[PDB]
Design an enzyme around this catalytic site. Structure first.
Site, mmCIF file in Angstrom:
data_model
loop_
_atom_site.group_PDB
_atom_site.id
_atom_site.type_symbol
_atom_site.label_atom_id
_atom_site.label_comp_id
_atom_site.label_asym_id
_atom_site.label_seq_id
_atom_site.Cartn_x
_atom_site.Cartn_y
_atom_site.Cartn_z
ATOM 1 C CG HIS A 47 -0.603 0.233 2.474
ATOM 2 N ND1 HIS A 47 -0.713 -0.766 3.427
ATOM 3 C CD2 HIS A 47 -0.115 1.348 3.067
ATOM 4 C CE1 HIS A 47 -0.246 -0.250 4.553
ATOM 5 N NE2 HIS A 47 0.114 1.022 4.392
ATOM 6 N N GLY A 60 2.392 6.117 10.300
ATOM 7 C CA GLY A 60 3.806 6.005 9.946
ATOM 8 C C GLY A 60 4.452 4.704 10.420
ATOM 9 C CB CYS A 78 2.444 0.917 7.491
ATOM 10 S SG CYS A 78 0.758 1.383 7.963
HETATM 11 C C1 S3X Z 1 -9.533 2.976 10.096
HETATM 12 C C2 S3X Z 1 -8.846 4.338 10.077
HETATM 13 N N1 S3X Z 1 -7.838 4.379 9.011
HETATM 14 C C3 S3X Z 1 -7.477 5.525 8.421
HETATM 15 O O1 S3X Z 1 -7.992 6.602 8.713
HETATM 16 C C4 S3X Z 1 -6.396 5.461 7.353
HETATM 17 N N2 S3X Z 1 -5.801 4.151 7.092
HETATM 18 C C5 S3X Z 1 -6.491 3.430 6.009
HETATM 19 C C6 S3X Z 1 -5.829 2.108 5.691
HETATM 20 C C7 S3X Z 1 -6.566 1.097 5.074
HETATM 21 C C8 S3X Z 1 -5.980 -0.107 4.725
HETATM 22 C C9 S3X Z 1 -4.640 -0.292 4.978
HETATM 23 CL CL1 S3X Z 1 -3.875 -1.786 4.494
HETATM 24 C C10 S3X Z 1 -3.882 0.679 5.604
HETATM 25 C C11 S3X Z 1 -4.477 1.880 5.995
HETATM 26 C C12 S3X Z 1 -3.698 2.893 6.820
HETATM 27 C C13 S3X Z 1 -3.556 2.447 8.278
HETATM 28 O O2 S3X Z 1 -4.327 1.646 8.797
HETATM 29 N N3 S3X Z 1 -2.556 3.045 8.963
HETATM 30 C C14 S3X Z 1 -2.242 2.877 10.326
HETATM 31 C C15 S3X Z 1 -1.653 1.727 10.844
HETATM 32 N N4 S3X Z 1 -1.411 1.504 12.141
HETATM 33 C C16 S3X Z 1 -1.760 2.453 13.002
HETATM 34 C C17 S3X Z 1 -2.360 3.681 12.630
HETATM 35 C C18 S3X Z 1 -2.688 4.696 13.562
HETATM 36 C C19 S3X Z 1 -3.220 5.881 13.141
HETATM 37 C C20 S3X Z 1 -3.466 6.107 11.794
HETATM 38 C C21 S3X Z 1 -3.175 5.148 10.863
HETATM 39 C C22 S3X Z 1 -2.608 3.905 11.249
HETATM 40 C C23 S3X Z 1 -4.373 4.267 6.775
HETATM 41 C C24 S3X Z 1 -8.265 4.716 11.426
HETATM 42 C C25 S3X Z 1 -9.001 5.475 12.328
HETATM 43 C C26 S3X Z 1 -8.482 5.829 13.559
HETATM 44 C C27 S3X Z 1 -7.217 5.396 13.888
HETATM 45 N N5 S3X Z 1 -6.684 5.698 15.227
HETATM 46 O O3 S3X Z 1 -5.549 5.335 15.495
HETATM 47 O O4 S3X Z 1 -7.402 6.293 16.014
HETATM 48 C C28 S3X Z 1 -6.452 4.650 13.018
HETATM 49 C C29 S3X Z 1 -6.985 4.319 11.785
#
Ligand code: S3X
Ligand code: S3X
Ligand code: CL
Lengths: 306, 305
Positions: free
Chosen positions: A41, A143, A145
Site C-alpha cells: 500500500h 507512519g 506501517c
Molecule cells: C480505520 C482508520 N484508518 C485511516 O484513517 C487510514 N488508514 C487506512 C488504511 C486502510 C488499509 C490499509 Cl492496508 C492501511 C491503511 C492505513 C492504516 O491503517 N494506517 C495505520 C496503521 N497503524 C496504526 C495507525 C494509527 C493511526 C493512523 C493510521 C494507522 C491508513 C483509522 C481510524 C483511527 C485510527 N486511530 O488510530 O485512532 C487509526 C486508523
C-alpha cells in the site's frame, strides 16, 4: 525470580529497518541481504485505498520512483516485484548487518516481539500475541506501517509479522513476510471488523504454571476435570477450546510442578467462577493470556519454589 | 492507537555486553571504550560473600585472573580498580560499538529498560520502574548479575542501573554505574529486606491520561479536589504524595485532554474509594504506576532513536 512481559533484544532487527517513500507516502521497510520488504500500500494514495488495483498502480512505477533510505544513505532500487500484499524492492547493496534469519507464519496464540518504527527509525519494543481472531493488540501510530514482529532463537531471527493497518476497534492487522494476511483481512479501506475475540486458554494455563514455579499456589483446588467438561465451562467465559495438542504441550510444565494439566484446568474453572477475591497472580488482577508454554519455560527457573 | 509497556530499542546496549569470569563465578560486564564495568562481587566465592573485605580479596588478584569474553573473542585485561560496588577492568581494546553514552543516577518513580543477560549474551528486554522503596520488580535468574538498565535520549544511552542481587521477596536491587546502591542495601550475604512499598501517584495519573487519549473515559467525573485533600486520601491508600512539581509535569497531558490535573485526581480518588466495579482501564484491573508522564507523551507521539 519475577515474571515480566519480556521482548527479545531488538538489535538484530534495528540494523534492518529502512524508510521507503513512493510519492507523498512514507513508511518502513525491512532490508535483508539485497531486498527491501514493505507493505504494497506504499504505492497508494488515500483515495486509492477504497478499491485499489495494485497491479495497475504498480505497472505505472519504475525502480527510481521508490526512494529507500538506510540511516543517512540513499539505497538504489534496481528491481521490484509484488508477492501477495508485500512489495519486494531489489537494491544495489546487500545489508551488511543482515542477521541469520527465516520467514515463519505463526498460528493464533503465538507471541512475538514488535519493534515499532517511524521513518525507518526504531522507537520501542514490546511483546504481543496473535489473537484467536487474527488481530494483534499493538501500539501503533500513523507512519508505523512496515514495522515487524519477530522471535529470536540462537542468534536466528524468525520474522513473523509486518504491520499494515489499524481496524476501527483500535486493533491491528498485518501479514507474514510472504505478504499473506493473518485473518480474513484485506489491504483496502473497506468495512472490515475484527471477529469476536476470545481468551487464549493454553497461554492462561502456562501462566498459572509460571505462578506455581514462582511460589504461588493459592488458586489451586482439590478437584480435576475431564477435557470435555472443562471446554463446556471455558466456552461460557469466551475462552478458546483446549485441545489434546494443548494438553500435550503443557506436559513439561505439568512434570516440573507436579500438577496434572486437567488438575490445573480445574483451578482455571474455579478462578473463572470466583474471580481473584482481592488477590493477584504474578502481579496481575486479570488472567494473562499473552505468555505461551514455551515463553514460560524460557523465562522461569527450571527449579520450582516449593 | 494502542498502549503497551514499551522498552527502548536495545541494540546500542547489546553491542556492549560481555562475560566476566573470576574463578568459578561468571557474570555480565558492560564494555564502554577500554573499560569493562561489572559488580565487584564477581571476586567472591560464597563463603567470602558472608563478610567480604573487597580490597583484601582484590589485592590478591592479577589482571590475568579476570577472563573477559566479548562474543567469541577473549579481551586482555591490563588494569583493575574498584569504585564503590563496581569493578572497572581496563582492557587492551576499545569497544568499536561504544555508543554515545552517559552514566546517570535516577530517582524512585523513574522508569528504564532492562536488558537481561546471561553469560554476556542478551536474552530479553523489559521495562520497569525504580520503586519508592528503591527495589525493582525485575525478572532475573542466576547469572543475570551485571545486566544493565538504561534510557535513550535522542542518540545518547543513559545507563542508570546495574543488577547485583535478588532479595527474599523476589524483588531486585542494584547500583548506578558509579557503584552506588539504590536503597539501603549492601553487596553481602546477610539479612536484608525491601521496605514497605508505595504506589507512584504521578505515574498512575499519567496512565489515566494515556487511557483517555486512547478512548477510555468511564472513570472521568464532574468533580475536582484540592492538592491537600487529594494527598490526605492518597496517603490513606499507600500512594506517594503528589507535589506541585508533579502537577506542573502533567500540564501538557492536562491541556491535550481538557482534564485538569486536580480533576484527574478526583477521578483517582473515586477509583481508590470504590474500585473499578468490574471494569478495566487499558486492559488492566489494577491502577498501573510504571509509566511516567514522559513515557505517555513519547508513546503517544512516536519519538524515534
Ligand atoms: C480505520 C482508520 N484508518 C485511516 O484513517 C487510514 N488508514 C487506512 C488504511 C486502510 C488499509 C490499509 Cl492496508 C492501511 C491503511 C492505513 C492504516 O491503517 N494506517 C495505520 C496503521 N497503524 C496504526 C495507525 C494509527 C493511526 C493512523 C493510521 C494507522 C491508513 C483509522 C481510524 C483511527 C485510527 N486511530 O488510530 O485512532 C487509526 C486508523
Ligand atoms: C537470596 C538468595 N541468594 C542466593 O542464593 C545467592 N545470592 C547471594 C547474593 C548476595 C549478595 C549479592 Cl550482592 C548478590 C548475591 C547473588 C544474587 O543475589 N544473585 C541473583 C540475582 N538476581 C537474581 C537471582 C536469582 C536466583 C539466584 C540468584 C540471583 C547470589 C536467593 C534465593 C533464591 C532465589 N530465587 O529466585 O530462587 C534468589 C536468590
Ligand atoms: Cl506458531
Amino acid at each position: 525470580s519475577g515474571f515480566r512481559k519480556m521482548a527479545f533484544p531488538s538489535g538484530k532487527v534495528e540494523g534492518c529497518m529502512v524508510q521507503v517513500t513512493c510519492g507523498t507516502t512514507t513508511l518502513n521497510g525491512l532490508w535483508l541481504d539485497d531486498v527491501v520488504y514493505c507493505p504494497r500500500h506504499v504505492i497508494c494514495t488515500s483515495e486509492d485505498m477504497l478499491n485499489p488495483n495494485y497491479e495497475d498502480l504498480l505497472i505505472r512505477k519504475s525502480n527510481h520512483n521508490f526512494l529507500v533510505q538506510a540511516g543517512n544513505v540513499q539505497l538504489r532500487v534496481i528491481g521490484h516485484s509484488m508477492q501477495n500484499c508485500v512489495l519486494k524492492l531489489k537494491v544495489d547493496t546487500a545489508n551488511p548487518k543482515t542477521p541469520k534469519y527465516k520467514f515463519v507464519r505463526i498460528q493464533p496464540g503465538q507471541t512475538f516481539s514488535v519493534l515499532a518504527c517511524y521513518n525507518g527509525s526504531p522507537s520501542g519494543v514490546y511483546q504481543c500475541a496473535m489473537r484467536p481472531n487474527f488481530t494483534i493488540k499493538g501500539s501503533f501510530l500513523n507512519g508505523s506501517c512496515g514495522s515487524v514482529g519477530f522471535n529470536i532463537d540462537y542468534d536466528c531471527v524468525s520474522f513473523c509479522y509486518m504491520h499494515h493497518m489499524e481496524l476501527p476497534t483500535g486493533v491491528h492487522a498485518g501479514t507474514d513476510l510472504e505478504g499473506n494476511f493473518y485473518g480474513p483481512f484485506v489491504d483496502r479501506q473497506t468495512a472490515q471488523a475484527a471477529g469476536t475475540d476470545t481468551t487464549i486458554t493454553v497461554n492462561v494455563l502456562a501462566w498459572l504454571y509460571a505462578a506455581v514455579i514462582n511460589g504461588d499456589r493459592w488458586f489451586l483446588n482439590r478437584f480435576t476435570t475431564t477435557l470435555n467438561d472443562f471446554n463446556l465451562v471455558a466456552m461460557k467465559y469466551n475462552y478458546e477450546p483446549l485441545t489434546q495438542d494443548h494438553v500435550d504441550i503443557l506436559g513439561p510444565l505439568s512434570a516440573q510442578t507436579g500438577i496434572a494439566v486437567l488438575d490445573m484446568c480445574a483451578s482455571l474453572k474455579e478462578l473463572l467462577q470466583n474471580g481473584m477475591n482481592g488477590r493477584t497472580i504474578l502481579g496481575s488482577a486479570l488472567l494473562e493470556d499473552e505468555f505461551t508454554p514455551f515463553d514460560v519455560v524460557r523465562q522461569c527457573s527450571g527449579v520450582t519454589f516449593q
